[PDB]
């Protein structure tokens, strides 16, 4: 019988079936590795990244310099993890997930930022934002085809908008 009848039958990120982990405060479901951070399979009750972000947000304009200067404390760590997950939640991001096909000065892809952020290889937010922006830099450097160029432009705008919304950065 369905262990979690009030929870999704497909992942929130890739929108696919399989072995799903179910949140205990909202009806979302995530693959073991599609969630960020990777699901702590033995934590009860387990809350997903959207509920933890809600908890932080309602109980916590800024300048981009100051945001980037922040050390990766658990709040900032969880915000960056959520921003990268929001990037994963778009289909176009699948183009930048695996290690690419060509040679740039420093290649970078989504899964490697997932790995480094998982192992807490970033001491400040600027490291994560800098690897994410380095993906788009290298894409604008090596690919000229119109379809994939537009694709990387769109994914870039998605990352930057989610970046300024989550860390509450000021316009103007």
């Amino acid at each position: 019988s369905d262990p979690c009848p009030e929870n999704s039958n497909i992942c929130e990120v890739c929108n696919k079936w399989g072995r799903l982990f179910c949140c205990d405060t909202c009806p979302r479901s995530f693959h073991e590795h599609c969630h960020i951070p990777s699901v702590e399979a033995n934590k009860n009750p387990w809350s997903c990244i959207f509920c933890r972000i809600k908890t932080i947000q309602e109980r916590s304009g800024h300048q981009e310099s100051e945001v980037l200067m922040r050390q990766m404390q658990p709040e900032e760590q969880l915000k960056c993890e959520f921003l990268l997950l929001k990037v994963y939640c778009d289909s176009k991001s699948s183009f930048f997930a695996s290690e690419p096909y060509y040679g740039p000065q420093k290649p970078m892809w989504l899964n490697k930022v997932k790995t480094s952020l998982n192992e807490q290889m970033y001491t400040r937010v600027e490291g994560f934002v800098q690897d994410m922006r380095l993906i788009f830099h290298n894409h604008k450097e090596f690919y000229r085809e119109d379809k994939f160029t537009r694709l990387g432009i769109q994914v870039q705008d998605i990352f930057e908008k989610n970046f300024r919304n989550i860390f509450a950065i000021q316009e103007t």
Binding site: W17, R19, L20, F21, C22, D24, V39, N42, N44
Partner: peptide, 10 residues
Amino acid sequence: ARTKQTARKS
């Protein structure tokens, strides 16, 4: 954390 098993034809 609770788990379940879903499938496209299920």
